[PDB]
């Protein structure tokens, strides 16, 4: 919000150079003049014979402007032999990626071509250059001894780069190992030290690199993006990288340890071709000292409104937690074909509020696709998804869309002020723009009145207006303002006060000055520094008796204030800004002299009471809860009385009741901070006496883990009364947990069996199908469905195995569903390939681990009926009902407190056999 959008700096390279494709700050230790590094990957160069070799330019922000190209390399192509080129610098895109740390700056040519040392192959190895003291070295990590599509000849090393906090460069090349991709990291010191120009592949001690993997991982583009940050345990910066084509174009983000290439966590894209991984960023959004991962997926298509698909782009925000398991959230693009997550640049703390912040770019969004950058402030919770600022497009278009925001750099403060600044590159217009943060101001407004009360008989002060016995009071406002960073000393604010609120439209004005005879008043105030809260007093009087229509209403005195822009100072100019939310006005209120006695002052007796209906907690799955409340004041009128229901911090508020007509339809309010878990509802400033109110409040709640024993509500009324201004605290029991109805049921797919089967014969060694007969599947399913689960349970199946001397149903194979093991009796598998009541048992008991929150275990028993069995058996063909049965018992309810409920049930399945 405090980023100045009025007067940024605009830099430009030659036409067609894609000037702005890459940007970064340069912070040299020597000279006071800081610079900016702009990548111009297509720019024509002085390198002889090299066409569009590309370059990087350092740009001065302070005093004399424009830009000078950094000369890394003036050389053309070397020759392996006569008229036999060793390398190809033409269209090598030097400058596609530029990163700096302290005195060091790294720039890379990902399209850099290289002839083989033996064969004629010209391969896209990619190259980089590290400059530092004076000193320039060539760093060509992917240029190595194994060169081809299978090795790294296609790596295009330098496609993405980043420095670790320590001295070591992490570099991403997308093309290694059939575009599996590769990360390689090297100590910068090692690079400069061991570079020998007569050696085309230089041996580096302590270099870390991934290896070839199984061929499925081909074309996954590891190292498309890159970022550095500590995740595993502590210590060294560990490695983050986007692998956008991974998992059948689903995309992933791999994290490898900084010490070894062992990898710790993975993230994976939502749907294919969303290019999850296009951009990646690492920074601590919540200032919890745990780095948080951000992942751009600019091609994502969410679902809005009607349900129609739309590519908005999406950014992932993964908050690190000490447990090792992250806390991820999603952030969806606001416009179609914006490509929302295309660049994610941490800015650090732009407002110096104590939490780091970040800019996410949708370079193809906004009016005329001019490009937009959304800026989001960090908070204790995490990233605040409602963006505090949207930087819009500057340049419209020429040929390409400008892609404003296609590149960004932040967190490095380019000017003197204590706040970070941000560069966005728009290569489609060959431009780069520096946005500078303004210093932030937090003001603390004070207000106080001498007494609190209103009476015409309160007469005190005189007045030049007329003979005066009149009821006046003292009003004093005050401003203490401060902020970190450069604040130009003495800051002037124009404050304005109004004493009514229930007025000023016209008609009857309730409050007047004892000086300026006005409801309205201005004041040129001029505070300074961080201290010395500056105050100014004014005595204001009220209407007296007659001619006043008066009211019960307290008449709210409101004070507001604004900073002065035209009186402000800087080198060129920067107008400082107020705080984001530090409300720019305040309200107070007194009471009426009415009631209480003949005093205007009294002390009522406040009473609160409540009642439940049933109170059965769902164990935390979607449980509706309304409690009826009876609040009564047995004393006199309580001034500015309001209900404070203090509830457990995990629970949500549904709404006011508006159902039971004995309940209030009135004014309620949420408040989560000052560590308040309380809900606050307004009863009005002039509350009544002998009055009693009844209201219903519905909620919904989880109550995470093992806190189950009852539910506790605390509620209390509170007021501005001199004595007994608060009610006693009121408890409210709630009965903990509940039971559920779990049921088991089953079926046999051929529930019937018809007459004599064709092509049937019976012997005592008739292998498999013809003799065994047709397959009959019997699926049985036990399911826990309800707001409770079974931590342990017992299942007992009885299977009709044999009638008398013959095996009726022969079990071929058994199958399993869910967290359950089982064991049978009278073993099933034969030579390869009532009904059961009180009669020969084929019973199997099974032990299920848990059926949790609408979950179930299922046993599918497929059997064949044995012919032996199917012999006529004396009396001719009759109807048999083959019955199996399954019973259950639920074991170990969750909590000892409250009525743990016994659950019992059983099932039977039947197969009717007729001719």
């Amino acid at each position, epitope marked *: 919000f405090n980023l100045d959008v009025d007067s940024p700096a605009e830099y430009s390279g030659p036409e067609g150079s894609y000037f702005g494709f890459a940007v970064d700050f340069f912070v040299p230790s020597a000279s006071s003049r800081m610079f900016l590094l702009v990548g111009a990957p297509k720019a024509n160069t002085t390198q002889p014979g090299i066409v569009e070799g590309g370059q990087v330019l350092k740009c001065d922000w302070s005093s004399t402007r424009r830009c000078q190209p950094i000369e890394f390399d003036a050389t053309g192509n070397r020759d392996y032999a006569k008229d036999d080129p060793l390398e190809f610098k033409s269209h090598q895109w030097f400058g596609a990626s530029v990163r700096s740390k302290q005195d060091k700056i790294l720039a890379c040519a990902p399209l850099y071509h290289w002839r083989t040392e033996m064969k004629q192959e010209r391969e896209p190895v990619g190259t980089c250059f590290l400059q530092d003291g004076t000193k320039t070295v060539e760093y060509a990590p992917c240029r190595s001894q194994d060169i081809d599509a299978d090795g790294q000849g296609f790596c295009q090393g330098g496609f993405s780069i980043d420095f670790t906090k320590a001295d070591r460069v992490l570099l991403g090349g997308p093309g290694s190992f059939y575009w599996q991709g590769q990360l390689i990291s090297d100590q910068v010191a090692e690079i400069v030290s061991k570079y020998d120009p007569n050696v085309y592949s230089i*041996k*580096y*001690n302590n270099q870390l*690199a991934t*290896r070839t993997a199984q061929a499925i991982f081909d074309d996954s583009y590891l190292g498309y993006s890159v970022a550095v940050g500590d995740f595993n345990g502590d210590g060294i910066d560990d490695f983050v990288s986007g692998v956008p084509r991974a998992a059948r174009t689903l995309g992933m983000v791999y994290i490898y340890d900084g010490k070894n290439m062992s990898s710790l966590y993975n993230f994976t894209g939502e749907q294919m071709a969303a290019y999850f991984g296009f951009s990646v960023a690492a920074t601590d959004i919540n200032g919890d000292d745990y780095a948080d991962v951000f992942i751009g997926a600019p091609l994502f298509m969410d679902r809005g409104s009607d349900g129609k698909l739309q590519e908005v782009g999406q950014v992932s925000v993964s908050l690190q937690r000490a447990s090792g398991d992250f806390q991820t959230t999603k952030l969806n693009g606001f416009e179609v074909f914006a490509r929302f997550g295309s660049a994610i640049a941490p800015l650090g703390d732009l407002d110096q509020d104590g939490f780091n912040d970040i800019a996410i770019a949708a370079p193809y969004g906004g009016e005329d696709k001019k490009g937009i950058v959304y800026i989001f402030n960090g908070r204790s919770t995490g990233l605040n998804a409602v963006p505090s600022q949207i930087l819009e497009g500057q340049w419209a278009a020429r040929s390409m869309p400008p892609s404003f925001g296609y590149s960004m750099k932040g967190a490095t403060d380019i000017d003197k002020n204590g706040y970070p600044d941000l560069i966005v590159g728009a290569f489609g217009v060959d431009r780069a723009i520096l946005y500078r943060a303004r210093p932030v101001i937090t003001v603390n407004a004070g207000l106080e009145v001498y007494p609190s009360i209103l009476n015409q008989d309160n007469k005190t002060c005189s007045l030049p207006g007329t003979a005066l016995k009149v009821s006046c009071f003292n009003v004093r406002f005050c401003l203490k303002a401060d902020g970190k960073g450069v604040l130009p000393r003495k800051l002037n604010f124009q404050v304005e006060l109004l004493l009514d609120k229930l007025k000023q439209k016209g008609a009857i004005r309730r409050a007047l000055f004892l000086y300026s005879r006005s409801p309205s008043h201005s004041k040129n105030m001029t505070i300074s520094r961080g201290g010395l809260m500056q105050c100014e007093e004014l005595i204001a009087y009220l209407r007296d008796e007659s001619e006043f229509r008066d009211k019960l209403t307290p008449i709210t005195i409101f004070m507001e204030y604004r900073l002065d822009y035209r009186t402000a100072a800087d080198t060129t100019g920067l107008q400082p800004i107020l705080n984001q939310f530090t409300p720019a006005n305040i309200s107070r209120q007194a009471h009426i002299l009415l009631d209480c006695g003949e005093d205007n002052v009294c002390k009522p007796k406040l009473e609160v009471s409540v009642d439940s209906d049933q109170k059965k907690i769902y164990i935390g799955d979607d449980n509706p809860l309304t409690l009826i409340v009876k609040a009564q004041n047995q004393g006199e009128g309580a001034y500015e009385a309001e209900l404070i229901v203090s509830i457990p911090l995990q629970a949500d508020f549904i709404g006011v009741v508006r159902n039971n007509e004995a309940l209030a339809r009135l004014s309620c309010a949420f408040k989560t901070e000052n560590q308040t878990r309380q809900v606050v509802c307004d009863l009005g400033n002039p509350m009544k006496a002998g009055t009693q109110l009844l209201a219903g409040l519905r909620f919904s709640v989880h109550q995470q883990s093992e806190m189950d024993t009852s539910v506790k509500f605390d509620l209390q009324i509170q007021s501005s009364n001199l004595f007994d201004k608060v009610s006693p605290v009121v408890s409210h029991k709630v009965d903990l947990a509940v039971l559920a109805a779990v049921e088991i049921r089953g079926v046999s797919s051929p529930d019937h069996v018809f007459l004599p089967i064709p092509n049937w014969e019976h012997k005592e060694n008739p292998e498999t199908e013809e003799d065994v007969g047709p397959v009959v599947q019997h699926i049985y399913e036990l399911r826990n469905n309800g707001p409770s689960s079974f931590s342990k349970a017992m299942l007992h199946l009885q299977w009709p195995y044999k009638y008398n001397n013959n095996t009726l149903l022969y079990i071929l194979h058994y199958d399993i569903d869910g967290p359950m093991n089982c064991t049978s009796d009278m073993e099933i598998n034969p030579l390869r390939i009532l009904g059961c009541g009180v009669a020969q048992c084929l019973k199997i008991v099974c032990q299920v681990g848990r059926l949790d929150r609408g979950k179930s275990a299922i046993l599918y028993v497929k059997s064949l009926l044995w012919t032996e069995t199917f012999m006529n058996k004396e009396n001719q063909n009759h109807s048999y009902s083959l019955k199996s049965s399954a019973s259950f018992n639920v074991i170990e309810f969750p909590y000892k407190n409250l009525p743990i409920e016994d659950i019992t049930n059983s099932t039977l399945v039947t197969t009717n056999v007729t001719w």
Partner: antibody
Amino acid sequence: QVQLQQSGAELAEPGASVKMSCKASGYTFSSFWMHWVKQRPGQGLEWIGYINPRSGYTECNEIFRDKATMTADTSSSTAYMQLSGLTSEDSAVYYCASFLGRGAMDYWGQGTSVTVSS
Amino acid sequence: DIQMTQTTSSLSASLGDRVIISCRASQDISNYLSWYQQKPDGTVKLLIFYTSKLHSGVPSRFSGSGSGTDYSLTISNLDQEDIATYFCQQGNTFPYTFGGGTKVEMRR
């Protein structure tokens, strides 16, 4: 700080197949070519062939063809040259060599003295 | 393959002398020639590559002279650790062809 740690002396009866080891410490092994050189006692240097780790591709010398069996363990950064059916003219100090650019093997091993006798 | 001939196999010299080690290729190898110093205990360190280049820690005393066939390792002022057996090796084409080596003999 590059060290090529070889196997110790290897005495083996004629016909047998010894297999020497070469540990590559101090640079990235799988990215560099591995040459082997044979020095017979009081004799000159006979190049045996090279092996590229990773890909595993190995081009031997034709005078040593069907003698030198070159393998490479990229998970331990260790080259291996097996010698099948070793005769007494295979008595020699064998040298693994890290291959630099151009025409030159940079940073060598200590040597393995294989001796075929009865 | 092209044979590498060093015609002088034992060069006697004092400390400080100028030692020009000649080595001729059979066929023109277009200047890929490595010079290796094998100390008497047998460890072989690389001194020069591509007809003249110093490799890292090798001192400036080893002048790389050569072109075409005729090549020559020109040792500057001699010292004790410079007493060893110097091989040339043709690296241009395949299979790599070494020389006979030239033993630097301290003079008494």
